[PDB]
């Protein structure tokens, strides 16, 4: 699984991308903020399926035991939803593209107490992506790093995960070298991208407090087939 | 500030290292679970004062506005406490070295509700440092990154923008320094960016523990250093 090349790594990651899901909002009925969280919960529940099937296609993931595959997914699912949302909303300044038929701004995000604080953190990350000019090849790499690194500190099983993590790091550097960046530009950009992952984790924790709901071990396992 | 060589970065960060503090000594008062949180709170408060002095000596930190210096320490003070604890406990498997005379295991962490969950995460990070053989020069770099990165996405004036641009230049200088250290230690170029990535990914877990811990301090609640308190220690005058 780790004999793939950097170019083959990106190729596998790109073709494994989940689809962009729509809201079940009846587009001819009056939209309402009281029903806003209903749409966002159903949407996220349906994105989790496609996320599971994306994870099995992350090179090296299915080499772990099913028990470990679940644990990483329990620990990373919210972070992956957020980085996906931030990615979709990247070309929509000041708004979050939850779905093509759910574009919200922070001024629709004050409907519930404790929401706009999370909203602004998501908007800030999207602005950071926009300044970074984050490439889709980098994005699928950052997303795979989240999947593998989120639950590794909460457990040969660990050593393999670290070999895949090192391999993704090789691929990120390969992209930056193929783009013409110098070596310092390469290790500076790699650093900047990984420091963003700290904010996404923080967003996840603060996100989870607001929601407190969590996908059970059995549900993630059923989805894993 | 930005002129410094990596070598000059490292000595500055090493010279700024706060001292290792102690809990109170008393041979007639045997350790009990009862006074633990009182000991730990007193130790945190005393460390916080020394943390301020270290922060002011992190190159480029006082170039920021005083208002943004506080927000960064508001955002990072707990992270810096834990990573300092993890560093002290690195050489002591299965224990957390809050002080040389306050070394605890997780059976003592079981005393307080919800504590052993964070206690076990701190030991896992200590073990992660152990199995990477984290060096002291890398340590002080990671601590400086936490100080500047943790609070930076949560500030948006024209001045706010040049603060953040300045922070990114310092963080860029630290990344250079980490690479220079790892190159100086004799790693190949692949192992350098692989180790840099391993180092920085730990910062994601340290953020995770800090949010976990912040939640736990509030479960039993004046828990956090306030803005005016942080400003007070930061906003020194020139009369000394
Ligand atoms: O609304 C919000 C939000 C809130 C405050 C500020 C900004 C955004 N969210 C959305 C959201 C809602 C409920 C939810 O709940 C957890 C699942 C629902 C039960 N699932 C378990 C089933 C158990 F019965 C898991 C998850 C995700 C959602 C949806 C899609 C997206 O791409 C991204 C997001 C982002 C965000 C994660 C922060
Ligand atoms: O016990 C714990 C702990 C808990 C659960 C699991 C494992 C460990 N901690 C210790 C701790 C306790 C209370 C505290 O409380 C907040 C300040 C005390 C009042 N301060 C505000 C008062 C001013 F208004 C701020 C801070 C720090 C402490 C001490 C020293 C250290 O180096 C590190 C730590 C780490 C840790 C932070 C997690």
Residue numbers in the entry:
A (entry chain B): 307 to 461, 470 to 526, 533 to 545
B (entry chain A): 307 to 461, 464 to 529, 532 to 550
The authors write:
Estrogen receptor alpha (ERα) is a ligand-dependent master transcriptional regulator and key driver of breast cancer pathology. Hormone binding favors LBD head-to-head homodimerization, helix 12 (H12) binding over the hormone-binding pocket, and exposure of the activating function-2 (AF-2) cleft where transcriptional coregulators bind via LXXLL motifs. SERMs and SERDs are comprised of a heterocyclic core that mimics hormone binding and a side-arm that disfavors the H12 agonist conformation. Rather, H12 packs into the AF-2 cleft via an LXXML motif to sterically preclude transcriptional coregulator binding.
In these structures, the T6Is are well ordered in the ligand binding pocket and form canonical ERα LBD antagonist conformations with H12 packed in the AF-2 cleft. In parallel, we studied whether increasing the alkyl group length off the pyrrolidine could improve potency. However, substitution with a fluoropropyl (T6I-29) showed a slightly improved efficacy versus propyl alone. Interestingly, the fluoropropyl (T6I-29) showed a rotated pyrrolidine that improved the hydrogen bonding angle with D351. The fluoropropyl-containing T6I-29 showed a slightly improved anti-proliferative efficacy over the propyl-containing T6I-14. As such, we used chiral affinity chromatography to separate the enantiomeric species of T6I-29. While T6I-29-1A downregulated the expression of these genes, it did so with reduced efficacy compared to RAD1901, laso, and ICI. Comparison of overlapping transcripts between the antagonists in the presence of E2 versus E2-only treatment suggests that T6I-29-1A largely engages the same transcriptional programs as the other antiestrogens with 12,042 overlaps observed. Interestingly, CDK1 and SUMO1 were uniquely affected by T6I-29-1A. However, T6I-4 showed no measurable AP1 activity, while T6I-29-1A showed a weak laso-like stimulation of AP1.
